[PDB]
Amino acid sequence: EWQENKSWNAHFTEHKSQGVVVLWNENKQQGFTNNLKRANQAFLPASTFKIPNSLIALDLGVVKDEHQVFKWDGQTRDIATWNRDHNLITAMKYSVVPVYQEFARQIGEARMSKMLHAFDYGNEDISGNVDSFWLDGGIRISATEQISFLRKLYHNKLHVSERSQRIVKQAMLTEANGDYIIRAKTGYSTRIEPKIGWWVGWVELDDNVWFFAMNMDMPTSDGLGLRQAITKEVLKQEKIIP
Ligand SMILES: Nc1ccc(-c2cccc(C(=O)O)c2)cc1
């Protein structure tokens, strides 16, 4: 079942922004959101696409393991952390587009299209350039669709090996302490309106898992920190985390 809690709208408006948070209680099989309509509106996945892209690259052998070094191509880019060697873990962490563009070129259109359909991922449409379609092509995914996809990943139910799924979930590790573990991926879509930020993943507790997917308007890069901050305020409000 699904519940709309418009009280969460405060967390967005108080920061002069608009967006949606979608939560899914795995034990109770219940979903919650501030905005049922936007929860089902499809956006460019941008760097959240690094989750499916990593899975496909690993399963096809494009990426051997999480230690394989992807050498910087020597082209200076405006993101300092991109101008260095990466492995899967650091490429995820710093959302290093050029590494994942190379993955996609090696995957190829045919295998990428087939795998996204097998994942039931978004609109499954890779129209555009194979090395940028998640940034300015035809692929779209909603917040509820991100949840559906992440739940399959959590349970190792995607049509790739258990190993590929374990490795990607390792690479998704974002935060861990004595109270919870967050595995997630940020996204930042600027090439097509509306510009949005994403944060999708889940929170692991001792006896339950809460999946989450949020997006919010992002007119400038100055509000990027609000993706995680707003999500955590909701989690705190719902007493999912202290
Ligand atoms: N102008 C600009 C600012 C920041 C970025 C950037 C880099 C790396 C990661 C992320 C993110 O998804 O949080 C965003 C990219 C362009």
Side-chain angles (χ1 to χ4, degrees):
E1 184 177 350
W2 287 91
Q3 181 186 336
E4 194 174 63
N5 183 344
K6 290 188 174 181
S7 82
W8 299 353
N9 281 326
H11 297 297
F12 288 100
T13 56
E14 291 177 355
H15 295 98
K16 300 176 190 167
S17 200
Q18 299 183 16
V20 64
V21 175
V22 185
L23 301 182
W24 183 264
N25 182 329
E26 186 67 7
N27 284 349
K28 301 290 187 178
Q29 295 288 284
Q30 283 189 349
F32 308 86
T33 180
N34 62 306
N35 187 332
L36 282 162
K37 183 182 155 213
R38 182 166 180 152
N40 286 293
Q41 283 177 320
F43 302 86
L44 278 160
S47 298
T48 69
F49 189 74
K50 286 183 175 69
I51 296 173
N53 204 359
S54 301
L55 288 166
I56 300 164
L58 283 159
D59 216 57
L60 299 174
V62 173
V63 174
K64 184 188 194 101
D65 60 33
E66 70 276 21
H67 301 294
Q68 180 175 358
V69 175
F70 311 108
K71 190 189 178 68
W72 175 41
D73 63 2
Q75 299 229 270
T76 301
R77 298 181 177 80
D78 62 351
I79 304 304
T81 56
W82 291 7
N83 302 325
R84 61 176 200 95
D85 298 347
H86 284 284
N87 58 39
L88 190 73
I89 304 297
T90 65
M92 282 285 288
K93 179 179 179 183
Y94 297 106
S95 196
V96 184
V97 173
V99 168
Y100 278 85
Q101 293 186 294
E102 182 60 31
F103 292 176
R105 290 188 286 261
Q106 292 187 31
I107 290 158
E109 280 184 344
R111 296 190 296 187
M112 185 75 77
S113 182
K114 291 172 51 92
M115 294 299 284
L116 294 188
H117 177 66
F119 292 169
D120 200 42
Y121 184 88
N123 68 0
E124 307 177 13
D125 180 0
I126 66 166
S127 71
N129 301 314
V130 74
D131 67 358
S132 75
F133 64 87
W134 61 96
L135 304 168
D136 56 16
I139 192 156
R140 302 287 189 281
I141 191 167
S142 72
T144 61
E145 288 172 350
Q146 295 263 24
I147 295 289
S148 175
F149 171 74
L150 293 165
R151 291 185 64 246
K152 294 179 188 160
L153 175 56
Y154 176 85
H155 291 292
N156 294 334
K157 289 295 179 192
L158 294 171
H159 190 281
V160 287
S161 70
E162 178 180 316
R163 172 176 180 278
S164 301
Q165 293 174 88
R166 282 185 185 283
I167 292 172
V168 170
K169 286 183 281 188
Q170 176 184 355
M172 288 172 60
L173 175 58
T174 299
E175 195 178 355
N177 53 44
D179 295 321
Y180 61 79
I181 298 164
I182 292 175
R183 305 181 186 275
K185 182 72 196 77
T186 60
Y188 184 23
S189 183
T190 58
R191 294 188 177 188
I192 291 176
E193 295 297 303
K195 303 188 186 62
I196 61 152
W198 282 102
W199 202 34
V200 307
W202 62 77
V203 180
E204 302 174 5
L205 311 175
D206 285 351
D207 55 359
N208 199 3
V209 178
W210 283 83
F211 295 84
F212 65 85
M214 79 88 70
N215 61 66
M216 59 178 293
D217 303 343
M218 196 61 58
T220 64
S221 60
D222 286 348
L224 281 174
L226 295 171
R227 298 171 298 180
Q228 299 97 330
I230 288 171
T231 303
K232 276 177 153 185
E233 288 294 48
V234 175
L235 296 172
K236 291 172 177 283
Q237 167 177 348
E238 300 300 310
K239 309 287 184 179
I240 294 166
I241 63 179

